[PDB]
């Protein structure tokens, strides 16, 4: 249905299981240490669209590697205002691959190399819940070389299709199961 979890795959992934995928991705695009003391303005802070603080669109480039993500939704971002450093709001999809292309000015971010996205995720976060809201562990974790909550949430999203199906189940697998869609091979 609407609110089931959709997933694109480049076919060179067909053979690879969500979860492998996900920790090699997440070990790829490393830590941009977005930490006190670490920020880097135009290295690592990345960029709404439309901004400044707010947007349809978060994106990120790696500072080891040409990976990139994009978290699509309805997104907010508090910086110095309680809950401090909150990322909360809408996530409705995540997007990984190479080369961060577009923009605001563009008509919205995209990945020139589009490996793998995960859609209708139906995470919504109140600004209540600060730093331990789901969306914020969920894209913080993009950042920082760790995705157990992205993997989590999409093992839930699975299961609720089908209890057969879980992050271990490849992208062929998950094809044949109606929820995963093959995109063309860089």
């Given at each position: 249905?609407?609110?089931?979890?959709?997933?694109?795959?480049?076919?060179?992934?067909?053979?690879?299981?969500?979860?492998?995928?996900?920790?090699?991705?997440?070990?790829?695009?490393?830590?941009?240490?977005?930490?006190?003391?670490?920020?880097?303005?135009?290295?690592?802070?990345?960029?709404?669209?439309?901004?400044?603080?707010?947007?349809?669109?978060?994106?990120?480039?790696?500072?080891?590697?040409?990976?990139?993500?994009?978290?699509?939704?309805?997104?907010?971002?508090?910086?110095?205002?309680?809950?401090?450093?909150?990322?909360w709001g809408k996530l409705d999809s995540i997007a990984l691959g190479d080369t961060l292309t577009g923009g605001a000015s563009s008509g919205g971010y995209a990945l020139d190399s589009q490996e793998v996205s995960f859609s209708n995720?139906?995470?919504?976060?109140?600004?209540?819940?600060?730093?331990?809201?789901?969306?914020?562990?969920?894209?913080?974790?993009?950042?920082?070389?760790?995705?157990?909550?992205?993997?989590?949430?999409?093992?839930?999203?699975?299961?609720?299709?089908?209890?057969?199906?879980?992050?271990?189940?490849?992208?062929?697998?998950?094809?044949?199961?109606?929820?995963?869609?093959?995109?063309?091979?860089?």
């Amino acid at each position: 249905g609407s609110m089931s979890i959709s997933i694109s795959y480049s076919t060179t992934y067909s053979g690879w299981t969500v979860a492998d995928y996900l920790a090699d991705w997440s070990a790829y695009f490393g830590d941009v240490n977005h930490r006190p003391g670490q920020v880097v303005d135009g290295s690592n802070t990345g960029g709404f669209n439309p901004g400044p603080f707010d947007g349809s669109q978060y994106a990120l480039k790696s500072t080891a590697s040409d990976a990139a993500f994009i978290a699509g939704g309805d997104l907010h971002y508090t910086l110095f205002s309680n809950p401090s450093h909150t990322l909360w709001g809408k996530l409705d999809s995540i997007a990984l691959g190479d080369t961060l292309t577009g923009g605001a000015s563009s008509g919205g971010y995209a990945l020139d190399s589009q490996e793998v996205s995960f859609s209708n995720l139906g995470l919504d976060s109140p600004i209540a819940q600060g730093r331990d809201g789901t969306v914020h562990k969920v894209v913080y974790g993009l950042m920082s070389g760790d995705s157990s909550a992205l993997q989590g949430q999409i093992d839930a999203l699975l299961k609720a299709v089908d209890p057969s199906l879980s992050i271990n189940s490849t992208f062929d697998q998950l094809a044949a199961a109606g929820v995963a869609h093959a995109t063309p091979a860089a």
